[PDB]
Amino acid sequence: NSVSVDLPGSMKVLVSKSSNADGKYDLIATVDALELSGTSDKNNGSGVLEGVKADASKVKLTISDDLGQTTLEVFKSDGSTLVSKKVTSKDKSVTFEKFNEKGEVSEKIITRADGTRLEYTGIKSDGSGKAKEVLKGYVLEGTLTAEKTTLVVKEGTVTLSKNISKSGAVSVELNDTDSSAATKKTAAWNSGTSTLTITVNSKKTKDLVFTSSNTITVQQYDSNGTSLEGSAVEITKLDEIKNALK
């Protein structure tokens, strides 16, 4: 009788074919063996369903009115304090949070639509913590504060810092403690093209592009230091990034 509705977050909800005397629709779903049920004033599969884990934790699935977003929450057995929350947004990106006993977020894992991830762990009450960015083929590691995420790669005396601000803006900087003017790397950041240009001995040597696809590419300049040569190469492993910093 009911109608199966496909949901963000690899879930399904069954909605009754017709409404009850109050005009409301019955909803049922099964999420990892847990039976959830609810009632809704819409007919499309949107609304709230509830159930319990085997350990008595409360579970709530909230489906937005237009089916674009789902939120799967686990609470303590009294339903008061959050334990975890998984939000699948309409781009199919996912935010997964764990909470401590005061309902404060202690872990946040963001999975972008392309599968790359930001992993924030050991989050404290000031919003500081440890940070990792999980890319295709490699991981970047660093820290989180309420101002920015800073991911760091070191090679020789060079430190490359990729910053993701609280607003999401990317900026990259390079600092080299080599004081020899012949070998010291410096770099300039172009926000318009998300490109870091490295210079050595007053000549541009390479462009590192931090793409909207969450990749990094590297392209060398000619010996003239003015024209790019060849074509940009996508970084596939951490060892590659280090090579570009030599």
From Swiss-Prot:
Q: Name one Pfam family in it.
A: Lipoprotein_1
**Record localization:** Cell outer membrane; Cell surface
Cross-referenced InterPro entries? OM_lipoprot_Borrelia, OM_lipoprot_dom_sf
| Top-rank taxon, per record | Bacteria
Name of the protein described by the UniProt record: Outer surface protein A
- Family of this protein: Belongs to the OspA lipoprotein family.
Cite the source lineage.
Bacteria, Pseudomonadati, Spirochaetota, Spirochaetia, Spirochaetales
User: Quick one: a GO cellular component term?
Assistant: membrane
Keyword Protein transport: yes or no?
no
Q: How does it sit in the membrane?
A: Lipid-anchor
Q: What does this protein do?
A: Induces host (human and mouse) cytokine release by monocyte cell lines via TLR2 and CD14; nonlipidated protein does not stimulate host cells.
**What keywords appear on the UniProt entry?**
Cell outer membrane, Lipoprotein, Membrane, Palmitate, Plasmid, Signal
Assign the protein's first listed, main location to one coarse class: membrane
